[PDB]
A paper describes a structure:
We determined the crystal structure of the hit fragment in complex with mouse TEAD4 to a resolution of 2.2 Å. The TEAD-fragment complex crystallizes with two molecules of TEAD in the asymmetric unit. The TEAD molecules are related by a two-fold symmetry, and a single fragment binds to and interacts with both TEAD molecules on the surface of the protein. Similar to the previously solved human TEAD2 structure, both molecules of TEAD adopt a globular structure, made up of a central β-sandwich fold and four α-helices on one side. After overlaying our TEAD-fragment structure with the previously solved YAP-TEAD structures, we noticed that the fragment fits into a hydrophobic groove on the TEAD surface. Specifically, the hydrophobic groove is made up of mouse TEAD4 residues Phe366, Lys369, Leu370, Leu373, and Val382. These residues form major hydrophobic interactions with the highly conserved LxxLF motif of YAP and TAZ. In addition, the two oxygen molecules of the carboxyl group of fragment 1 form important hydrogen bonds with the sidechain of Lys369 of both mTEAD4 molecules in the asymmetric unit. Therefore, due to the overlapping positions of fragment 1 and the highly conserved phenylalanine of the LxxLF motif, we propose that this hydrophobic groove is a druggable site for the disruption of YAP/TAZ-TEAD interaction.
Author numbering:
A (entry chain B): 209 to 245, 253 to 427
B (entry chain A): 210 to 245, 252 to 300, 303 to 426
């Protein structure tokens, strides 16, 4: 009730970044969004069904199947203050780490919704490595999908942050992590976005979704 | 004076939303509309290569092949003041005229923030009328990408925001003689949203080097 964790799986790290080679040896790594990990604040899941309305297979159906301790909402304030010109010397990447007390094979589903419609669905199977009494699932510098690279470039073309925020009111991502054998939902994370108001600095706020 | 080469000219072009209100009453909202003596203003085609499809088969290559008199830029102020909340038909219509009986190939490419997102290709056929030859597209369905795009623009709170988005949105239409492969007309389209009370408007330019 302190972090993005169920009984069987927890997020340690998540990041999306732009890495720009300045020299043969020297690199700038700009973090668009970044989580690295007292009680979490709570949000009743009915407050967010309007942004994730979906019928069959949707958030509501997933939540009702449970377990109710697997469901989180993350709000990101994305830092878009970075140069995106010189494409050749740029790598858009994602990294993440999860941890479990047991050796599971997991299925990770990511759905991106834009103005109501599902625009991307990515499904991957991940496998653990034993490390320090636990089982670790680690993605290191995987390429950011092209949709998201192009979305960032579109946001940055807008002349005012308030326009970026208007667009982002209609943008969500839903991540569902499932045990491949048991089909148990291990983690389900709903993500919403604004652009960070600050000149430089990504922020996040994590909530535990409830229904009480 | 108008969108015309030696071998083909546009008479009419429209995109519309038709909403049947009862058995005999319908609303027809025009998003954009051209119906057609001073000279057209000119635009250097190098200014617009970055907004259109480049590389093999791209605007630059097409322009250099010529003929140079076949190339036009149309700016639309699209009228988005209409209800888009079931009984609706989103449609496109157009008419062309030629002095010769050709089979024509119409290619339409939609480009969004650099990338080609839709390509449509159609073959159209002539009808003789009074020593010339007429081509007509009547109530062809607007592609799903464009409907949706309209619906997304209409969710935005401000027309200036809609116009910022539209700066990186273009459509390229290339009309070719199917048998000779001659370029008959090439029209680059760019967009703004029309202001309140305004309706649909357009401005036509002749692309040059
Ligand atoms: O979704 C799109 O492709 C674009 C858009 C998306 C993100 C930023 C700027 C424009 N759009 C169009 C209408 C609302 C957003």
């Amino acid at each position: 009730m302190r972090s993005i964790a169920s009984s069987k799986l927890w997020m340690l790290e998540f990041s999306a970044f732009l890495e720009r080679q300045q020299d043969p040896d020297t690199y700038n790594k700009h973090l668009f969004v970044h989580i690295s990990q007292p009680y979490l604040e709570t949000v009743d899941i009915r407050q967010i069904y309007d942004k994730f309305p979906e019928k069959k297979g949707g958030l509501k159906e997933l939540f009702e199947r449970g377990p109710s301790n697997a469901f989180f909402l993350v709000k990101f304030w994305a830092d878009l203050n970075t140069n995106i010109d010189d494409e050749g010397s740029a790598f858009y990447g994602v990294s993440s780490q999860y941890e479990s007390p047991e050796n599971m094979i997991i299925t990770c589903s990511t759905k991106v919704c834009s103005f109501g419609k599902q625009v991307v669905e990515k499904v991957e199977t991940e496998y653990a490595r034993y490390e320090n009494g636990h089982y670790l699932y680690r993605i290191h510098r995987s390429p950011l999908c092209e949709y998201m690279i192009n979305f960032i470039h579109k946001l940055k073309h807008l002349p005012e942050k308030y326009m970026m925020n208007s667009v982002l009111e209609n943008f969500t991502i839903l991540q569902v992590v499932t045990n491949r054998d048991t089909q148990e939902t291990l983690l389900c994370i709903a993500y919403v976005f604004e652009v960070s108001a600050s000149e430089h600095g990504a922020q996040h706020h994590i909530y535990r979704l409830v229904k009480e």
